[PDB]
Amino acid sequence: ANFMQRAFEMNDKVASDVMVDRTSMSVVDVDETIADALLLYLEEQYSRFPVTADNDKDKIIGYAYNYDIVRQARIDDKAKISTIMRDIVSVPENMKVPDVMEEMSAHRVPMAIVIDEYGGTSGIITDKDVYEELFG
Amino acid sequence: ANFMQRAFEMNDKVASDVMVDRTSMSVVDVDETIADALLLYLEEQYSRFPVTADNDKDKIIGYAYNYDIVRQARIDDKAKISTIMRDIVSVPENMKVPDVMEEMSAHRVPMAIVIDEYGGTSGIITDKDVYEELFG
């Protein structure tokens, strides 16, 4: 019910309990142009988009930040996502939530990619997903 | 140093321990244009700005969402912030942190304005300020 309990529950949860699952993700490709990313943002609002290699959801190489997209479009919207892309951290489905949070912190990324046993993509996690568990 | 210890502490903290104080807030005015607002976003990067009345930081009447700003800038950036402004909530300085996230939730807003005893602006709270507390 209350916050301190939601905190306790979440303390024991793992990456796969909290993540946005692979089937619900919206991605952009390393070879799409900024202009493409811009139109995607305007349509879906997410502030961070996982960037795929080879148009493969199972090959997330980083993320693109909405700020970076709208800023660069004013400059040269034909540039490729790769010119703005920034790093992520990957974590196994079974990592305890706080351990992922700390991984995101040690690596200084706002996105963790949850990976399966084969190294495919199970889903992703960001702060917005943590705030849902703690505050419905 | 760990999550559960960080959550315990925050549970006992008050709206003013955690807010962004008035001196650090960035505002836009209700009579400023989208064009203005876009230039601010591009310069300062926050995703939400408190919107003032009469250019007064002590009269916050809502917030402006970056998504609304970039989206509208493309249609008619001469439009005024009031055309896209959305609702806030206000809380007293001494309201316990979990209780405010609850007010925010109840009133479906992403921002609380922390009020002083005269009704002036003490500061603001958004999810981000919560994460800095639990994560960072």
DSSP codes joined into one string, A90-105:
EEETTSBHHHHHHHHH
| Selection from A72, A89, A87 nearest residue A37 by Cα | A72
Q: What is the dihedral of CA A71, A72, A73, A74, to 10 degrees?
A: 60
Contacts of B86 (CB under 8 A, 6+ apart): B62, B63, B64, B65, B68, B109
Name the residue of chain B whose CA is nearest to A131's CA: B127
Q: Does B1 touch chain A (CB under 8 A)?
A: no
Report helix angle B127-134 to A127-135, nearest 10: 90
Task: Classify residue B112 by burial, with Cβ atoms within 10 Å: 0-12, 13-18, 19+.
Answer: buried
Gap between the Cα atoms of A100 and B60, Å rounded: 37
> Which chain A positions have a beta carbon within 8 Å of B100's beta carbon?
none
Q: How is the beta sheet containing A28-29 ordered, strand by strand? A: A28-29, A48-53, A56-65
* Candidate CATH numbers 3.40.50.300, 3.10.580.10, 3.30.450.40, 3.40.50.720; the one for domain A1-136: 3.10.580.10
> Which chain B positions have a beta carbon within 8 Å of A43's beta carbon?
none
CB contact at 8 A, B135 and A108? no
Q: Does B106 touch chain A (CB under 8 A)?
A: no
- Cβ-Cβ contacts under 8 Å between A and B: the total is 54
CB contact at 8 A, A28 and A52? yes
C-alpha distances out from residue B89 to A93, B42, B102, B111, B123, Å: 37, 26, 11, 7, 12
Three-class secondary structure of residue B20 per DSSP = strand
Gap between the Cα atoms of A58 and A120, Å rounded: 5
Strand duo B28-29 + B20-21: pairing: unpaired
Question: Which of B3, B11, B101 lies closest to A135 in CB terms?
Answer: B101
To what resolution in angstroms was this structure determined? 2.2
Both tokens of B89, joined, read 């909530």
Q: Does B101 touch chain A (CB under 8 A)?
A: yes
Gap between the Cα atoms of A59 and A113, Å rounded: 10
Question: Which of B3, B101, B131 lies closest to A127 in CB terms?
Answer: B131
Name the residue of chain B whose CA is nearest to A130's CA: B131
Q: Which technique was the structure solved with, according to the deposited record?
A: X-ray
DSSP 8-class letter at A53: E
Overall residue count recorded for chain A in this entry: 136
Strand duo B28-29 + B48-53: pairing: parallel
Both tokens of A71, joined, read 């800023």
CB contact at 8 A, A10 and A133? yes
Backbone angles phi, psi at A107, to 5 degrees: -90, -5
Gap between the Cα atoms of B91 and B133, Å rounded: 19
